[PDB]
């Protein structure tokens, strides 16, 4: 289908005001190499002032933090999910179906992906690089987008109805049961992919 309105919300959610947009991709490359990240440390690796990176993790306020205040979670995260993405054996997770097809091409690894369809609790598992997907296992696994909102936090608004589904007709099954989500929308996992890489073209011209 038509997965304009899922790009442009996207990015409107990273580019708003305080929004995450320059912040996001030092901060996955980090989070990538498994251990928790200082936000003195992050402010160093942007070179930006602390007040700059606190805003902008102030108004991001489902970023998750451990027991020493670090970072442990933005998207990509330490924390246990239904998202399992293991990178060179170290097993990370995400907190959406969508993310683990996006931080590939922004961290230069290739993933492991794994999770169970929310309709049926089948396994799903595919492998994800930066340019391609591969193993997709089953092979009409799907997606469910919903339309992102004005100002709301990603992670309730959008990353808790973005899953994984053994196929596209369970998933429309599902769908039709949950229509009071906005812009719910069932797209198999090859078009999912194509609209994470449209979102990271987007953020990398952006980037500075």
């Given at each position: 289908?038509?997965?304009?309105?899922y790009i442009?919300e996207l990015l409107?959610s990273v580019?708003?005001?305080?929004?995450?947009?320059?912040?996001?991709?030092?901060?996955?490359?980090?989070?990538?190499?498994?251990?928790?990240?200082?936000?003195?440390?992050?402010?160093?690796?942007?070179?930006?002032?602390?007040?700059?990176?606190?805003?902008?993790?102030?108004?991001?306020?489902?970023?998750?933090?451990?027991?020493?205040?670090?970072?442990?979670?933005?998207?990509?995260?330490?924390?246990?999910?239904?998202?399992?993405?293991?990178?060179?054996?170290?097993?990370?997770?995400?907190?959406?179906?969508?993310?683990?097809?996006?931080?590939?091409?922004?961290?230069?690894?290739?993933?492991?992906?794994?999770?169970?369809?929310?309709?049926?609790?089948?396994?799903?598992?595919?492998?994800?690089?930066?340019?391609?997907?591969?193993?997709?296992?089953?092979?009409?696994?799907?997606?469910?987008?919903?339309?992102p909102?004005?100002?709301?936090?990603?992670?309730?608004?959008?990353?808790?109805?973005?899953?994984?589904?053994?196929?596209?007709?369970?998933?429309?099954?599902?769908?039709?049961?949950?229509?009071?989500?906005?812009?719910?929308?069932?797209?198999?996992?090859?078009?999912?992919?194509?609209?994470?890489?449209?979102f990271?073209?987007?953020?990398?011209?952006?980037?500075?």
């Amino acid at each position: 289908m038509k997965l304009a309105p899922y790009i442009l919300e996207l990015l409107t959610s990273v580019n708003r005001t305080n929004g995450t947009a320059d912040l996001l991709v030092p901060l996955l490359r980090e989070l990538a190499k498994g251990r928790p990240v200082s936000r003195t440390t992050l402010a160093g690796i942007l070179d930006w002032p602390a007040e700059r990176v606190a805003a902008v993790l102030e108004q991001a306020t489902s970023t998750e933090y451990d027991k020493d205040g670090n970072i442990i979670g933005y998207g990509l995260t330490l924390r246990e999910t239904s998202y399992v993405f293991e990178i060179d054996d170290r097993r990370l997770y995400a907190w959406c179906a969508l993310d683990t097809l996006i931080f590939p091409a922004l961290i230069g690894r290739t993933a492991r992906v794994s999770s169970h369809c929310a309709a049926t609790g089948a396994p799903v598992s595919l492998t994800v690089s930066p340019s391609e997907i591969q193993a997709v296992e089953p092979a009409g696994m799907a997606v469910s987008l919903v339309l992102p909102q004005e100002a709301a936090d990603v992670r309730q608004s959008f990353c808790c109805h973005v899953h994984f589904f053994a196929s596209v007709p369970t998933a429309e099954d599902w769908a039709s049961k949950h229509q009071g989500l906005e812009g719910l929308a069932i797209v198999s996992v090859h078009e999912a992919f194509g609209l994470g890489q449209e979102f990271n073209r987007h953020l990398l011209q952006t980037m500075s």
